[PDB]
Amino acid sequence: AVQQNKPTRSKRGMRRSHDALTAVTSLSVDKTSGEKHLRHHITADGYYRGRKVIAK
């Protein structure tokens, strides 16, 4: 548990090298409205596959 000595800035950087988040960068275009949304998700106004699926 208790360390012998502290690691480096280099060790911290090589540890956090795999902590880089990945963006999706795959935003889709709706058929009717054309608003930006994710894959298999509805829009902010409830559009999905052109049909008003939320009815709200």
Binding site: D19, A20, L21, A23, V24, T25, L27, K36, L38
Partner: protein, 110 residues
Amino acid sequence: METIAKHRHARSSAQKVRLVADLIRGKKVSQALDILTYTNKKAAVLVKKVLESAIANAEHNDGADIDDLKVTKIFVDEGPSMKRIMPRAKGRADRILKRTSHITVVVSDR
């Protein structure tokens, strides 16, 4: 291009905000908005607010037509740390840190 947009004393640690800010480096501005819209971080919304402030600054005081605009130099460098006292076992005390972060966005049209 000048007219930078900084954000002093953000209420989050500089590391996670920096990991959010590593997504957009030289990307398009509308693409940066599209990334920060669906990025599931509180720091993503907190830097999207600063990015929209930079867009409004760019279209207000200087060389607009956001269609030709790029987010060049974003960097998040740590700020002051508020001192707090957290009681622990055996009577001893530990001192947690309320960490802040300065978030400077340098946007350019050329």
